Amino acid sequence: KDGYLVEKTGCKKTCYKLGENDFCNRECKWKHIGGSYGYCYGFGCYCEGLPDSTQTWPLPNKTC
């Protein structure tokens, strides 16, 4: 259960803070709450612990 965060257009969310990136925690802790771990990895928001039911990048076959 590990994916990235999407956006209105579906574009991921690059960040300038690797590791425990609160900015990613507050952004990941938005829709749904099943998520348990939200940190950045590779200059990108990454959430871990949320089932596919939640929203996560890459979005469906339709890119951003």
Domain locations in the chain?
1-64
Q: Which residues pair with 43 in a beta bridge?
A: none
Which sign, positive or negative, has the C-alpha torsion 16, 45, 24, 48?
A: negative
The type of residue at 6 is: V
- Nearest residue to 5 via CA among 20, 26, 17: 26
Tokens of 45: 């928001």
What is the domain class of 1-64 according to CATH?
Answer: alpha beta
The experimental method, as deposited, was NMR
Q: What radius of gyration, in Å, describes the C-alpha atoms of the chain? A: 11
Largest Cα–Cα separation, the chain: 29
